[PDB]
Subunit: 295 residues, 4 copies
């Protein structure tokens, strides 16, 4: 037998950083969860019990805190590239670093219409994420994403004209609820190294904001023919607005809300045009994915 | 042996209701999770296998949907009182109904600065809850609450002057992070029945909004001497603003963020006045509770 | 305003202890999660910012580890009583301690039919719990429990003869699946103090084992007329076997498995006597409770 | 823009099936959670709102229940291959089916030393899983796995001789706790179609059992030099015992238990050879992966 692939590192490293403006007294906080996995010439730790090749996962954890102390942590695409580059440059035998970052929301509170200098609220479990793969001699590959964005529209969603055969019971509809949790990922063109990533720094926050805005607007305004058709419209617009993105992927659950027929009880009308009370279904759920690129 | 207490019913009943304004085309959604447990003369179902006394939990579920179809579901204090009253009035042998409601957030989206007529976003897992106990001949007891409100302040929290003995290692501090998940409950004076609850309907939403506002403002503005001292200030203000509340209870975790000493690495300074990077701790956590009433 | 009630302390304190037999080389591990909340003359920490009355929650955490170092941690009823007594005896102004312990399973592995001296497996998320309330001048109140015991029987459960009215759609049945997660609590007679708790030490493990055995046997053997009727039989037997128990409480979800009518597809028969494939329902669920005591 | 990849289907489909032996009266239950995602000529549903190409996800759900009614559901490798083959054979324009199955444990109860005919217990959240990819003209690729197997050993684990530099604080050790949650996957050689899968049916359960046995024995008996070294020994043995497996992958968290220095309190000794009480750490955790194949 032989080692075909191996990677190891530290997962679930929680980090908080605060920035204090001495002039204004305004403080800004960042909180993330980080995972770093390394690859390289490490097979002998598996096959020969040779620990000399192992950068201890405890040391990886230390390195994350040290790097956060000495560098900006925003945008996360920059921080992840700095962190990944460190490992491949510092250790001769490590040839790839894989960095995943989840950014948690701490939104500045408004108290009496004014932004508070040092108090924050977690407004939703929506996350902004990055996956950064730093590979020695092959540059830096970055995938950025938003996830946990949960939305619902109460009308202007349809689903009719699908295949009907002996396995089909679903009725065609011209008016239904549509609800999903959005997971959207945009993949950047490959970067040659940290200098190139630094030159594009302003594009990271702007593209995140655009992806979010396009997602919300298209969801709210599209008279949706299916999840498939609506998500394609979102991905098309994002690609049109940022030339440095190569692909956009969406992964969308279809979270079903079922009509409840109440006619058995005193002829009460609660279906079709009379539907007011619905039963949200915890499971099963549709799951629809698509990756859109440039033609 | 003998039955000392018994209650039974349906838990985890998810309900969605939509309201459609025909004039404006504006739609508003409500989504809740409901639990109803009944008590009364039901001992024989336990001791004698006498099912004749059991209102099936499946029937309780039906009743929830029917009641939501025929009545407003907001404010939840009103809906819960209607639902509880139904069971004690309809069934001679049922003498108490216990209704718990969790309200989930569906906040209307703003698209291009305008409120959208039928699209919504889940902005945070914060909940608004009610517990309604309807007891035949003893009226209606309502506890209202907010929970899952997660906040953090990066300075203006202190903790010094606590008891020090041979079990104490904690250092006194004049500047720390304070972060918690707020659970706050206000208990209404007892109501004689549904007519009285209906007469106070406008106070329910207003008091929820006040409790929330007071919580956020006090948290952000108090130069906090301890969780204990700050939470007391919150409860005191809520009681001052709503005479129909008898008690306010807060239950607050103290979610610790620890300094990381980096001086072992090239004398890097990251403690006290130089602290920028911190380690959020998942566990253990302080837990501080208090119930404040009128003197 | 005035403080009507207050308690504070440390929650989610994870503790592991190992015992090593020097003779046999056999090691035994215990792992728990502990919460300690204190009450007493502490109102001024809330009303006056007087921290002098506060035993820091960090110190409570230290005390848990120290107590675990110097005392047995099994049975958990004994450990919790030791821990609670410590706080009310050590601090003049603290008059009650409330200790909750969750014990996690680490079951010794069998390798080639022999018990391994130092390797363990987590066989199920079933827990053994205690709640110990130590109140100065009123002794020690202990509630012991098992929870997270998930069982299912595929036949020999019935449910017929329940109340039928205009809210009822549920069909009577003489053969259904019954599945639940068992939460069972037995409350001990009040103990005068630690000496009395120590005198009953052998009864704690034996009663836990009896409660578990009775639960499983009765579930498997009862031709069940309802959850209500079966759970009563369990509680009755436990009370008969241990005179020092005052009450037994069960809290049982009814986790529904629904028939799926497939007759729309080529007349396929999958209901009643022909039912083979079922749809487990995540929600809603019945919830049935009862507290049984001595007559 | 263009669709580069697309797949869609139904996730979280819970299924229960019971088998009844008429002779013995013995019943056996199976419970699974299933996900089916389809690929093929479906781009136009995304780009042109052409629903005619969509097999509704609701119909996929129906098909799962129908297939479970008409076929054995065990071993899951066989069931998944049947289900995947159905979709690519039934629909001309669907060319790949991806089936994921999670099998939940329902272990027959022993009551008074005898196996009960129809009562079951969930002994642990350990799962047996399959991923089946059925691709038209390319056969059937099956990955089998076990996951959620949580183990701990209290001694006979070491970790010394790792790289030490200016980022390293971790002390070398010759005696530590080792605890992990095992995720192990074995990938079968490609099968030409359903006939070939059926010819190997007895190997599926036997190989699962071998993978489990090897994992537990090696964990318990290896005087472990690192997670890396121990996991390699496991994978090597599995490959030696089943020639039809091409690769074995393990993914293992290192769940840390930290010593607690208590010497600040009355010189209490709780480190090194005197360590008895430890603090389990919820996060961060090491994460170690390896894929082993044949040389
Ligand atoms: O938008 C939808 N897309 C689908 O593929 C589907 N299948 N059922 N309902 C559905 N809705
Ligand atoms: O605000 C606090 N209250 C407390 O009781 C405490 N104990 N440790 N840190 C603390 N902080
Ligand atoms: O055992 C049961 N008890 C109940 O109270 C009930 N209500 N519906 N089904 C039920 N089953
Ligand atoms: O077994 C281990 N492997 C590792 O790579 C490691 N790093 N720190 N501790 C460790 N333990
Ligand atoms: Na390198
Ligand atoms: Na009544
Ligand atoms: Na005392
Ligand atoms: Na096909
Ligand atoms: Xe951070
Ligand atoms: Xe969508
Ligand atoms: Xe609702
Ligand atoms: Xe607070
Ligand atoms: Xe312990
Ligand atoms: Xe039961
Ligand atoms: Xe199944
Ligand atoms: Xe391991």
């Amino acid at each position: 037998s032989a080692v075909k692939a191996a990677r190891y590192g530290k997962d679930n490293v929680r980090v908080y950083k605060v920035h204090k403006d001495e002039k204004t007294g305004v403080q800004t906080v960042y909180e993330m969860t980080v995972c770093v996995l390394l690859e390289g010439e490490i097979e002998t730790s598996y096959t020969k019990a040779d620990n000399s090749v192992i950068v201890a996962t405890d040391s990886i954890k230390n390195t994350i805190y040290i790097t956060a102390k000495q560098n900006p942590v925003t945008p996360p695409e920059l921080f992840g590239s700095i962190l990944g580059t460190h490992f491949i440059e510092k250790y001769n035998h490590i040839h790839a670093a894989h960095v995943n970052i989840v950014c948690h929301r701490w939104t500045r509170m408004d108290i009496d219409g004014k932004p508070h200098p040092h108090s924050f609220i977690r407004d939703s479990e929506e996350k902004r994420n990055v996956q950064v793969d730093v590979v020695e001699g092959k540059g830096i590959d970055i995938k950025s994403s938003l996830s946990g964005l949960t939305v619902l529209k109460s009308t202007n969603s349809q689903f009719w004209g699908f295949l009907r055969d002996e396995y089909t019971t679903l009725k065609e509809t011209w008016d239904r609820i549509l609800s999903t949790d959005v997971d959207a990922t945009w993949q950047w063109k490959n970067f040659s190294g940290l200098q190139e990533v630094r030159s594009h720094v302003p594009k990271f926050d702007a593209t995140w904001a655009t992806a979010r805005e396009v997602t919300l607007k298209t969801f709210a305004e599209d008279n949706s023919a299916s999840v498939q058709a609506t998500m394609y419209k979102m991905a098309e617009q994002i690609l049109a607005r940022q030339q440095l993105i190569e692909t956009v992927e969406y992964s969308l659950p279809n979270k079903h809300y079922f009509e409840i027929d109440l006619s058995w009880h005193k002829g009460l009308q609660n279906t079709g045009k009379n539907a007011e009370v619905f039963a949200p279904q915890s499971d099963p759920n549709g799951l629809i994915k698509c990756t859109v690129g440039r033609s």
